[model samples]
Target: RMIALDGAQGEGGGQILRSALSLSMITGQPFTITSIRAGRAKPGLLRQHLTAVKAATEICGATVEGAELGSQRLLFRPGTVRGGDYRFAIGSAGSCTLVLQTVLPALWFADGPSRVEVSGGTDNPSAPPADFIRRVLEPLLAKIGIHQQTTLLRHGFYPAGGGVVATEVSPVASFNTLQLGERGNIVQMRGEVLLAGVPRHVAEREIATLAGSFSLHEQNIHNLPRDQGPGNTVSLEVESENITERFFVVGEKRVSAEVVAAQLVKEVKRYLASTAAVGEYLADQLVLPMALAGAGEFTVAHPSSNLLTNIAVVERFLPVRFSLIETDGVTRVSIE
Candidate 1:
């Protein structure tokens, strides 16, 4: 089976490429796309996407054509998945999670075992960080009988995409049904403020602001001093009984540090009051894996346009169903 994609469809960006890459590996299908990520502001493949394509090619020994950085179109045909040791460095701080997500599905089903070393922007402002992928996403996948382990060797935030990550994956071959309805209790919480190329006091300012709002011990708060590229950003994460909500306040050149912290804090409070199994992005992500595993479902906040597009993409690959269910003023996107 093969899937053809229009690069400019829907959100029209790397997600189209990413979703297709992941699906191709899981289903062992070939893919052809025109105007790859054409909907993006810059459009087409970049350094990151090229890295992902190359890495996937290595993991699966995929027969891929039109693999080039900044290309508008491409084709990919996967071959036998060979799991072992591999490394891919993005040369810039592109989202390593995107690269990992591309190869993870296939590697999870590889023969013996697989280990990957990735170098790039682990925490890009627009994408989930390595920590988020490993700590939150991985654990949820594990609960569904998909075991893929990860480690963050370093934190690369943004423009300075020099972070490193390591991962080990053992494919389960078969997956189990999953239902995330009730979250047991308030288990734990963690937060980190990574500042790069910003004011030295930016992190401290955010920590002090959050401290004023809530009781956070020193251990619960962390500040990572590193280069996050040319820009600056502040992030706040909340991990509860069932799911984790990550909020970000990208630092604009002229904006004050407090605005960054304020926006982040607002989101944290908002998600803390909400209840959802798969967060926004994860809502879109859980679809294909759940479909491949045979059965699964999750409750999430209102469906984003991106989430809806993802639903359409999943339908192209499998008989995956998604819907929005509203109860008690909370909107949830159900995946089955």
Candidate 2:
């Protein structure tokens, strides 16, 4: 019998379903999830969620039930995970990085290597951006003995949704335990402005604001091509010896570029203030991978609701126990 999961658990969001799909594929454990995304407004399977389900099914030949949009339940059966060339399109302004996240774990254990191309919103506010995946997440994965090369082929923003990203993944023989307690010495701080159909002054103002907050070098400002849609994003990258942390603020019609940059500055400051290696966002993202490794530890600014939710979800599938300790203005998570 497949393990049953309630999608309305913990955070009551789509992560439960996404993590379940990934774990089911990796562990060969079937699962049934009901009340999917029950907590979100206009709930159930959204385009991104459906795309994730389809992508998981494609990579692993999984049997699925009730995967349509707005459906509240899904049944996923185990199948062999195969690695090869694959492409998935969300067809909406949904997050493509999330779709890749859904299946990338399983592919890491495949019999061979794989190449994947995902097209959709690459810089969605609700999800991790492609840059985050490449700079932050992928490097952590490398520490865990998973090798993958990721590239952002094009920029994609909301409403228009034409961004593209490609990745090449190789199977791992075994996972290595990671112990990232401190962020170590700071190597460099850089800012990048992704402007597409937006004014150049927005980028200038963003860089100017960032300069006031951090000691960024002249070459720290990166202006990417307007290859995608009418999107604007201000990104900050913190490179350290132990880890690389990145934060992004998407530009909106109502918000000023200075405001966006300020928001990013605030986030970066909060992270810097902490003695932890992983930020709140990266903390949640690390749960599954650490659980898969079966042994790891990292300090975070705080244990967010999403982090706690992911911990519970991972525990339900993997025989792993997580211990979260709060001390000295940071929380440490240890997987045993």
Candidate 3:
């Protein structure tokens, strides 16, 4: 029997589709989702989404229907999980990070070690940057015994679509329970500006704004080559005793450097204000891994619609449940 899912449910975004692809491959359960991305401005399969479908199809030889652009429905039947060198291109400024994420979990249980290369937008505002996967998400996944390494080969900004990212994943034999409740004391704080084909003065202004809000030293400012981007992004990394969280704001045509930096400052302050070990973004990304781990818990400022939506999808496939408890100001999410 095939499982049925509504792409319009919950967050009503690409996340629902992505999670379904992952769970489908892992559990060997075929599924069909209708009204794909129904809540989005332009719903249904886009370039990036189709790229993900193609990647998943190749890796596992999955049979798929309605995989063309602007289709409102999809039917996916996964084949055997095959692990080897694979490459995928989104062909647009779509987020390569998302394509990598879609196929990554299945590779964990692959026949052998797998290496994947994805080419597209690396630093899209709508999706997590490759650095976030390498720094924040990878470390946390390791705690639960998922072994993988990620690298950014080139920087890709929106509209240009020329970034590259690679990952190598080893088979996961088992999962370990993770308990991340308290975030402990701050160990280090650093701010970096990645500018490509942008003015140096933008980096200076952004760094200056960060310095005022959080005492980041002069050594913290980093400048990258103007190649691979017409992009500017301000990133703030918080290294606490127990965990590390990263917040990024992309510089836009209309937005000033100071305004972008100030926005990131507010995000950092809000996370620092909470006792939660995970930020909102990290919390949402953790749901699948935690469910696979069978038992794990983390404290977050609050569960987003994305996180809750993911939980619903995961439960439909795996024999697992998520418990979300709000105590004081923070929400603690645990898997059962």
Task: State which candidate has the highest lDDT.
Answer: 3
Better of 1 and 3 by lDDT: 3
Write down the RMSD of candidate 3 (Cα, Å): 1.3
> On a 0 to 100 scale, what is the lDDT of residue 333 in model 2?
96
TM-score of each: 0.88, 0.96, 0.97
How many pairs of residues collide in each model? Answer: 5, 0, 0
lDDT of 2: 0.87
For TM-score, candidate 1 versus 2, the one ahead is 2
In model 2, state the lDDT of residue 174. Answer: 82
In what order do the candidates fall by TM-score, top score first? 3, 2, 1
Candidate models: Cα lDDT each: 0.73, 0.87, 0.89
- Using lDDT as the yardstick, the better of models 2 and 3 is 3
Q: Residue 130 deviation, candidate 2, in Å?
A: 0.9
Candidate number with the higher TM-score (2 or 3):
3
Name the regions of candidate 3 deviating beyond 4 angstroms: 217-227
